[PDB]
Design a protein around this ligand. Structure first.
Ligand SMILES: OC[C@H]1O[C@@H](O[C@H]2[C@H](O)[C@@H](O)[C@H](O[C@H]3[C@H](O)[C@@H](O)[C@H](O[C@H]4[C@H](O)[C@@H](O)[C@H](O)O[C@@H]4CO)O[C@@H]3CO)O[C@@H]2CO)[C@H](O)[C@@H](O)[C@@H]1O
Length: 377
């Protein structure tokens, strides 16, 4: 059942937390942020050159968030990786700790604060997101074994809700090549080399054996299979980790009380999507685009859907259409009861999106935050 005394499950489209000792079971909401850096050359969450790590946690909690998605790369969850970019004068308790002991300390404290953590295997290397869950010198078996060691260790922390199996499965070539050419992810192709729907089942099963109490989060790909993608006019224009159009015909085969679908969705600050042109009816055209790419998974099919990344500069140094985009997206989440989400990012040092923090790592973008906090009321 559980090593921590806490057990997570999905009933209907809602995540519940069970306490086996008190017997309490309540629905939870994930009002989340992404705090990144363990996936980069820093090997640690960013901003610890400017801030104390507990204080960052306390500030996140104080803004109403109760969940952090923590991106990691393979090197950061191995014993002995040295972090760069910590002011030890501000973080004395982190002196001489390796990146793993820091991740342990951060998650423990999060727990004490009542913050859920979702572990995200964000990159295999520490430089960029790979299209597949393996590379030339890192196999799916190494990927799975990395998740098993992570689940073995982090399964002991009550507030770790689960595993976001791989960030942003995607493509590096164009369709039609992308479907068969083995360089990118697919879904419903019937090809184990590339089918993210099949890979998710294999990786999720491995993790549930060691952490049966966890949820498994599964993202979209970019392209799926040609019949799915051509069946919608914007079928070729989903984000990385954003195409869930294949779930209806090819659902992922994990237990229904364990599985959470986790699409990503972005604004004009990340990529100038063609449906962002007002001549295409932006922004009033978006709800139908969101619905087709991922929203029907919940609205029509009844699955838990947690948006795992979304954000943008909200007009601070970026495309002024980002303000309209983020407003419209949060309107649609609220009206369709997409209440669980993780914003990208808490960090201001996201080059195309900024974050909830400003560049001083201390003050927030009030307007951006005010729009988002509508989901938290
Ligand atoms: O991790 C530290 C790093 O994060 C960067 O922020 C990234 C996230 O890490 C990532 O999860 C996500 O990635 C974007 C990616 O940056 C875009 O390049 C990619 O663009 C695609 C689009 O999805 C397609 O529809 C279109 O056809 O192709 C374009 C590119 O050709 O979209 C994905 C999301 O789907 O988002 C975050 C924002 O980019 C920070 O920017 C960086 O500073 C941090 O170091």
């Amino acid at each position: 059942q559980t090593p921590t005394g806490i057990y997570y499950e999905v009933r209907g489209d809602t995540i519940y937390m069970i306490n086996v000792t008190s017997g309490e079971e309540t629905p939870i909401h994930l009002f989340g942020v992404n705090w990144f850096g363990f996936e980069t050359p820093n090997h640690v969450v960013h901003g610890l050159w400017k801030r104390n790590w507990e204080d960052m946690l306390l500030q996140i909690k104080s803004l109403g968030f109760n969940a952090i998605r923590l991106p990691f790369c393979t090197e950061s969850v191995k014993p002995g990786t040295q972090p760069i970019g910590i002011d030890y004068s501000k973080n004395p308790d982190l002196r001489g700790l390796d990146s793993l002991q820091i991740m342990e300390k951060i998650i423990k404290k999060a727990g004490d604060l009542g913050i859920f953590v979702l572990l995200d295997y964000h990159r295999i290397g520490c430089t960029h997101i790979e299209p597949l869950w393996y590379t030339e010198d890192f196999s799916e078996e190494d990927f799975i074994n990395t998740w098993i060691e992570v689940a073995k260790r982090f399964g002991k922390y009550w507030n770790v809700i689960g595993a976001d199996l791989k960030n942003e499965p995607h493509s590096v070539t164009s369709p039609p090549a992308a479907y068969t050419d083995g360089t990118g992810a697919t879904w419903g192709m019937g090809n184990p080399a590339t089918d993210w729907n099949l890979a998710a089942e294999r990786i999720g099963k491995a993790i549930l054996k060691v952490a049966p109490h966890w949820l498994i989060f599964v993202e979209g790909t970019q392209f799926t299979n040609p019949k799915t993608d051509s069946s919608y006019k914007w079928g070729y224009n989903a984000w990385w980790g954003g195409n869930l159009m294949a779930v209806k015909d090819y659902p992922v085969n994990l237990p229904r009380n364990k599985l959470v679908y986790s699409p990503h969705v972005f604004g004009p600050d990340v990529y100038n999507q063609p449906y962002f042109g007002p001549a295409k009816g932006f922004p009033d055209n978006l709800p139908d685009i969101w619905y087709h790419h991922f929203g029907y998974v919940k609205l029509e099919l009844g699955y838990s859907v947690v948006i795992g990344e979304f954000g943008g500069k909200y007009g601070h140094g970026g495309d002024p259409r980002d303000v309209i985009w983020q407003n419209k997206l949060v309107d649609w989440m609220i009206e369709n009861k997409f209440c669980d989400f993780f914003y990208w990012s808490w960090n201001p040092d996201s080059g195309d999106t900024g974050g909830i923090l400003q560049d001083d790592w201390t003050t927030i973008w009030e307007d951006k935050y005010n729009n988002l906090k509508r989901l938290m009321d």
